[PDB]
Each structure stands twice: as C-alpha cells, then as structure tokens.
C-alpha cells in the first residue's frame, strides 16, 4: 500500500469494516502502520479489529478441521487442508507480531498505547500457541505470557481498575491461563480479583464509562460462571 496516502488507508479501513471486508481492512491498516507514524487510539482499534476478525475466522476453520482430523484418527486430505489453514493462520499472526515489533511497541510510550500493543502481542502468541505442538509450543507460550505480564504490570501502575483496556487485558490473560497454560486456578483468581477491583471503582465513572467497563466485567463474570 506504499503509494496510497495514510489518511486514505485509514478511510478505506473504516469503509472495509462497514462492508465486512476484514481482509481488506487488515491490509489497509498494515499499510497505515507501515507509514511509520504512531497510531491514534481509534487507529489502534481499527488495526486490532481487522486482524481479530481475520484470525478469528481462521481459528474457527482450524477448529472445524482439527475436529474432523481427530475423529478420522479414532487419505492425507484432512491433514493437508488443516495444515494449509494452519500455515495461513500462522502467517497472519507473524504479520501482526512483525508490525508490533517493527516498530509499534518500541515507539509506544504512553501507557494506553503500550498496554494495547503488548496485549495484542500476547493475543497473537496465544493464537500461535493454540496450534503449536511440542517444545516450540513451550517457547511460544512463554512469549505470550511475557507480553501479557509486561502489559499487566504497566496497567496496574498506570491505569484505573475500570479502564477497558486493562479489563480486556486481564480477561484475555485469564483465558490464556485457563486454555493455554493449564492454570485454571490462576485464571479464576485473576478474573475474580479483576472483577472485584473494577466493581469498587465504578463509583468514579460517568454513565458512558460505566457502560464500557460493566460490559467487560460481564465477560469476566461469564467466564467465572463457566469455570466454577
């Protein structure tokens, strides 16, 4: 997208979202990141929405194919096609991780941007971990953990307990503990503490901030209900 203006890429990413063209949206936002300027809050959200939708469809397809493959192991085509989808998913995760490493994280100095990008880094390593098999699974899991932990440390020092990014980070790190790291008790403790500390800070919020924070709190509660 090197020949298109930054502002035109951002405008087209918003159009692509309205058209539910998430592959295009991700390509526009990759082009925008590669212009080299930092991203605003709204631009960070466009980048994240685009890739979450792309990789979310890949993950759903990989899970369907992995389930068919496991049943068949109870010709080579199911494994071949699961491998094709898996390689495509890994390529998208590697692309997002490469944007974060070149150079979104290193230029992110405010807590809101740095936490946002480190949460994304944890998420995309988590998606790599979902499809990883063996000892490389261990290093990928540790990369997710390390990114989430750095984001947690910053968020607890610099943001209030109701901040939606802080809440979504804690939600996704709790999912990491439950689903990836085989640490359900850590998942439950993090979700409970996060929920309780947010509850106690709701009194400080406007009506609109209250709505934003309570929405994510309900997701934490939904997981606690499933896990307990």
């Amino acid at each position: 997208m090197g020949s298109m203006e930054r502002a035109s890429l951002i405008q087209k990413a918003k159009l692509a979202e309205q058209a539910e063209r998430y592959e295009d949206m991700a390509a526009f936002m990759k082009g925008a990141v590669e212009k080299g300027e930092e991203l605003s809050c709204e631009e960070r959200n466009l980048l994240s929405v685009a890739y979450k939708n792309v990789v979310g469809g890949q993950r759903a397809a990989w899970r369907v194919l992995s389930s068919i493959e496991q049943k068949s192991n109870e010709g080579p085509e199911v494994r071949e096609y699961r491998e094709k989808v898996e390689t495509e998913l890994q390529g998208v995760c590697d692309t997002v991780l490469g944007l974060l490493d070149s150079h979104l994280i290193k230029e992110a100095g405010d807590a809101e941007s740095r936490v946002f990008y480190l949460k994304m880094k944890g998420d995309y390593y988590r998606y790599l971990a979902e499809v990883a098999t063996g000892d490389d699974k261990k290093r990928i899991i540790d990369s997710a953990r390390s990114a989430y932990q750095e984001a947690m440390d910053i968020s607890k020092k610099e943001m209030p307990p109701t901040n939606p990014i802080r809440l979504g980070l804690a939600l996704n790190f709790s999912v990491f503990h439950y689903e990836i790291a085989n640490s359900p008790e850590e998942a439950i403790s993090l979700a409970k503490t996060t929920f309780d500390e947010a509850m106690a800070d709701l009194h400080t919020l406007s009506e609109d901030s209250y709505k934003d924070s309570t929405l994510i709190m309900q997701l934490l509660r939904d997981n606690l209900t499933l896990w307990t």
């Binding site: 709204e42 959200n45 466009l46 929405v49 997701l219 896990w227």
Partner: peptide, 9 residues
C-alpha cells in the same frame, strides 16, 4: 471461555 470479542470498532 470467552476472550474479548473485539470484532467491531
């Protein structure tokens, strides 16, 4: 277990 949906800006 649900993560942030995060599919809509």
């Amino acid at each position: 277990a649900g993560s942030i949906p995060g599919r809509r800006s």
